[PDB]
Design goal:
The chain is of the alpha/beta class. The protein contains twelve helices and 18 strands. Bound molecules: chloride ion. The site of chloride ion has 4 residues, from loops. This is Serine protease NS3.
Length: 451
């Protein structure tokens, strides 16, 4: 005899039709959806469709490569601007790689099926990618599938799960604690703890570690190397920023979620600048994705989501919305049309389509500052639109006095490329380049002309 197992996934013809944007949920961990993406790709190739798969992270991309083994899959790095084979091939790349290629090449294929995994990702490049994809679909040039449990527009913090979740509302430490939270450390299972910042995570992680807990920390910059370690069993806590809202699959029994985040906001009273506001409450969708780390396994029925406070849905002042438009406005198309945001996300900005469009060398510098310089979209836009070349780092030193960067109450002083010692004092302030120690380290590297 045998077990039935997951049955063959017969694909809806509708999902391949041009002008169709399908939203679906893979419900990972159940686990009864292993055959879905493979089947979609198989049927796409049967129909001779030019197919693109977009993963949120390199990690997820690699897991896809394994899942799709035996199919003509080709991973695409952002180090290459285009890669055209004479052959039937499915391109696989990160959200950001797609947007980067659209900004940097005239040779981006006319994909007529586009699959975006974790399509809720609200990083500017992901938002822009959705805008471009939805525009191509509405043009009748493509069909697309957005895969996510929380499609843009969703406002449900407590959505369906594969397995019962116990939603527990109680006070959660925002920093190191001495007593009064025994439930945190008495818990015998594995916990994923969402924190608003790396700094906050450091404090929490250190406090857990001093009590004998084994802790893995995750952030955007460290996700690539550290996440793989969570696939082993030798940990008690994952302490992570919001990055783990995007496809991270933990074998854990508990989420701890104070429902806090930092939000980049462009201020406009005086010289435009980006601050990191908060901690403030997360959106319902974010809360849902944090909660959604657990309750994935029907055989494990006692998972917990421990949270504090209610979410806040209004995020219209998030810098990512403006930054999305800065990317979109600089993506061209042979039709001569500037791509607009995905429908549900249009209400997030009152920017006029095309207003951030740059021309010629300024556009190229814009892209280089983001790719090679690893600068935020907003900051890259300000520098590029000022007519500054990539290699010209004078602007890092010629800002007003109030723009002086501090570290430990000390005024930061660095070498220029030419070998002069100057105060770090950028013409444009973006908190995302100096707030976190590691971010400031990288920005100092940039200012000194070392990349
Ligand atoms: Cl992060």
């Amino acid at each position: 005899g045998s077990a039935m197992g997951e049955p063959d996934y017969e694909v809806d013809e509708d999902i391949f039709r041009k002008k169709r944007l399908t939203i679906m949920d893979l419900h990972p961990g159940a686990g009864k959806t292993k055959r879905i993406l493979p089947s979609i790709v198989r049927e796409a190739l049967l129909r001779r469709l030019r197919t693109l798969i977009l993963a949120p992270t390199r990690v997820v991309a690699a897991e896809m490569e394994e899942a799709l083994r035996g199919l003509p899959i080709r991973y695409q790095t952002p180090a290459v601007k285009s890669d055209h084979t004479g052959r039937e091939i499915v391109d696989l790349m990160c959200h950001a790689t797609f947007t980067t290629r659209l900004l940097s090449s005239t040779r981006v294929p006319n994909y007529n099926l586009i699959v975006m995994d974790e399509a809720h990702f609200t990083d500017p490049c992901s938002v822009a990618a959705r805008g471009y994809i939805s525009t191509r679909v509405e043009m009748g040039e493509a069909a697309a599938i957005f895969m996510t449990a929380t499609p843009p527009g969703s406002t449900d913090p407590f959505p369906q799960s594969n397995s019962p979740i116990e939603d527990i509302e109680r006070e959660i430490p925002e920093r190191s604690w001495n007593t009064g939270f025994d439930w945190i450390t008495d818990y015998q299972g594995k916990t994923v703890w969402f924190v608003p910042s790396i700094k906050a995570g450091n404090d929490i992680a250190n406090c857990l570690r001093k009590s004998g807990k084994r802790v893995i920390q995750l952030s955007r910059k460290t996700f690539d190397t550290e996440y793989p370690k969570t696939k082993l069993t030798d940990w008690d806590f994952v302490v992570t920023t919001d990055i783990s809202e995007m496809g991270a699959n933990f074998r854990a029994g508990r989420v701890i979620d104070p429902r806090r985040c930092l939000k980049p906001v462009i201020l406009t009273d005086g010289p435009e600048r980006v601050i990191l506001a908060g901690p403030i409450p997360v959106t319902p969708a974010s809360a849902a994705q944090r909660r959604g780390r657990i309750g994935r396994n029907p055989a494990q029925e006692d998972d917990q989501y421990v949270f504090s406070g209610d979410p806040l849905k209004n995020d219209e002042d998030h810098a990512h919305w403006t930054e999305a438009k800065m990317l979109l406005d600089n993506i061209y198309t042979p039709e001569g049309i500037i791509p607009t945001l995905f429908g549900p996300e249009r209400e997030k900005t009152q920017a006029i389509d095309g207003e951030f469009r740059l021309r010629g060398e300024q556009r190229k510098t814009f892209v280089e500052l983001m790719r090679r310089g690893d600068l935020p979209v907003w900051l890259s836009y300000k520098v590029a639109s000022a007519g500054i070349s990539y290699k010209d780092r004078e602007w890092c030193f010629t800002g007003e006095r109030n723009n002086q960067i501090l570290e430990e109450n000390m005024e930061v002083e660095i070498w220029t490329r030419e070998g002069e010692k100057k105060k770090l004092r950028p013409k444009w302030l973006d908190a995302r380049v100096y707030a976190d120690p590691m971010a400031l380290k990288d920005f100092k590297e940039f200012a000194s002309g070392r990349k």
